[PDB]
């Protein structure tokens, strides 16, 4: 098993980090955030109906895009940087062009066809984007035409999480039914399926190598599944913390495993050995979102207190 | 700072001013959760957004921030103040939410 092999591995030690930055330009709960590939600009959705582009180094506000619907659950930042996206209880996904000639920000396209709300969305290119919905399915899109190209039905309950592979060829997503399924973008078939949890899966992320993923459930548990052994390798639970898990994220090497809870904290777990090494406590209310840069330099953490901090 | 960083800071300050203006504009808005069909109605210099809505996790995930829940937070019936009533209904909702807002302000200022 994993524990037997990892017994001889030396531990990590206590993890201490502080709020280097505090970004204060929102007035309601923050539900999502996403880093730019440069790991300097980041976008934030809030229930105030606003979407602010942040200069992380100076705390400068680069853009402030107003939204038609204030009920938003998702952000996205195109890898090129020219487009952001967002979705929520409008059941549509809006795309914004950040680099126009008139000097403003305009909506490029609105995507319609999903029957249920939008849970997550992540660009694959400037023209491709995969979204998740409460219809128990997902889809691929063409933003130059606005029509779906694929559909990935088969789940029983609502899909609440989504995680593109590093190559964006494979795709795993969790559902209200406690199972995660591996989807192929270019074939539209469920390659693998996984089980083991007992509650709705709220967050899912991909290991930096693409051979595994982490499933954070609403019953205070996480598990490390694999795409070759096709079974869980570890658990992450503690009797002191019995609540939901609201976010999950690895680090640049996969040796550390961030997380978020309804207990106003972000317990810094460990991957190889389940022993918990670290805690972050700097938020008045619970933490919705949790992201780690591409260069592993910082960890942004938005929360229901309308502030988001940078921890290093 | 250089001549361009200062201009960027000026732009950031202008964005801050506009965000403050928009926030002050939205301080006269109320979300009357009802428990999709959305009824917006104004009354006595105050707007109301009523939302009509199968799972307990859905309600907690996106509606815990509402002001005063109305069932035909606080309770309006037709910390957790409960009010009952049966042209007069709108005024009753107005009074209930005004009380809720005043109590929330007092809680914010620590006097509660």
């Amino acid at each position, epitope marked *: 098993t994993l524990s037997q092999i990892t017994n001889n591995i030396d531990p990590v030690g206590r993890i201490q980090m502080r709020t280097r930055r505090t970004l204060r330009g929102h007035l309601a709960k923050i539900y999502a955030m996403h880093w730019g590939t440069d790991s300097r600009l980041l976008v934030s959705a809030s229930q105030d109906g606003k979407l602010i582009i942040w200069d992380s180094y100076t705390t400068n506000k680069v853009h402030a895009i107003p939204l038609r619907s204030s009920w938003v659950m998702t952000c996205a930042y195109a890898p090129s940087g020219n487009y952001v996206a967002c979705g929520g209880l409008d059941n549509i996904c809006s795309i914004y062009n950040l680099k126009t000639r008139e000097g403003n920000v305009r909506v490029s396209r609105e995507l319609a066809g999903h029957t249920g709300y939008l849970s997550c969305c992540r660009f694959l290119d400037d023209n491709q984007i995969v979204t998740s919905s409460g219809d128990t399915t997902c889809a691929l899109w063409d933003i130059e035409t606005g029509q779906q190209t694929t559909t990935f039905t088969g789940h029983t309950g609502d899909v609440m999480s989504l995680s593109l592979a590093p190559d964006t060829r494979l795709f795993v997503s969790g559902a209200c039914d406690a199972s995660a399924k591996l989807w192929d973008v270019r074939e539209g078939m469920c390659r693998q399926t996984f089980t083991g949890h007992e509650s709705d899966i709220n967050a899912i992320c991909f290991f930096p190598n693409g051979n595994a993923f982490a499933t954070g459930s609403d019953d205070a548990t996480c598990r490390l599944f694999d795409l070759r052994a096709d079974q869980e390798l570890m658990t992450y639970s503690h009797d002191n913390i019995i609540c939901g898990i609201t976010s999950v994220s690895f680090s640049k090497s996969g040796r550390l495993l961030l997380a978020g809870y309804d207990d106003f904290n972000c317990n810094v777990w460990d991957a190889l050995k389940a022993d918990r090494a670290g805690v972050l406590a700097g938020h008045d209310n619970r933490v919705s979102c949790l992201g780690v840069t591409d260069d592993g330099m910082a960890v942004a953490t938005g929360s229901w207190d309308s502030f988001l901090k940078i921890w290093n | 700072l250089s001549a361009e960083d200062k201009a960027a800071v*000026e*732009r950031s300050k202008m964005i801050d001013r506009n965000l403050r203006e928009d926030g002050e504009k939205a301080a006269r808005e109320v979300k009357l959760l009802l428990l999709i069909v959305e009824t917006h109605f104004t009354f006595k210099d105050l707007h109301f957004k009523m939302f009509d809505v199968s799972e307990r996790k859905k309600w907690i995930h996106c509606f815990e921030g509402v002001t005063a829940i109305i069932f035909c937070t606080s309770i309006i019936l037709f910390t957790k103040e409960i009010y009952t009533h049966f042209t007069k209904n709108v005024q009753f909702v107005f009074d209930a939410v005004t009380d809720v807002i005043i109590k929330n302000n007092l809680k914010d200022c620590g006097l509660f």
Partner: single-chain antibody
Amino acid sequence: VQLVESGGGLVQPGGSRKLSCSASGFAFSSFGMHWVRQAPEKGLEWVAYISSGSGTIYYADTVKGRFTISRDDPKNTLFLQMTSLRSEDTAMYYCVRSIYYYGSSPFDFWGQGTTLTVSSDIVMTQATSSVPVTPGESVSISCRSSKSLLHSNGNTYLYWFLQRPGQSPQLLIYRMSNLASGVPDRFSGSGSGTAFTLTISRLEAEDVGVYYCMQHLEYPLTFGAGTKLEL
């Protein structure tokens, strides 16, 4: 996007004049505006500047006091009120726009000037101003600053412009490395502090004109002498 100026003409010495510019096709209030003039036989010379929201104004040390700059946002108009004119102010005046955030390109669009006739500082050198050119050939322009334009945050502020005969200048490269939109990929720029160059791969048609280099680090903005290419 259009920028067109009015006014100008012939004015006796000591008589006040007013120049105006109208803007259409973009968000006027989100851009800073500049005035730039050039004598009939000399190069460009920055005159005055007003920021977005009118919260900051700058003037040259040769027209300070006499001139004034102001903008009307609802009417999308920029004004230049000038008094006590002299023979030193006989030049064609251009209007330029600039927007400043992380990653933007200032000095994008130039207007069409209006001719006016009347009856400490960073210095740069572009003494090379006559070089023969041949089609399908590569030439390198030079530009040197008195002090180091590189800043602590990693940005070096050197801008390149090209003025085709009978037209207004256009932006080629901003901050010494980034290529402007609509500019062919054969234009390249490089060079450490106080030593900069511009590179062109193929010298085809429409690449002939006068090239200038400008610095944006200290608010008095100084242009180079200019480099002219001929067939």
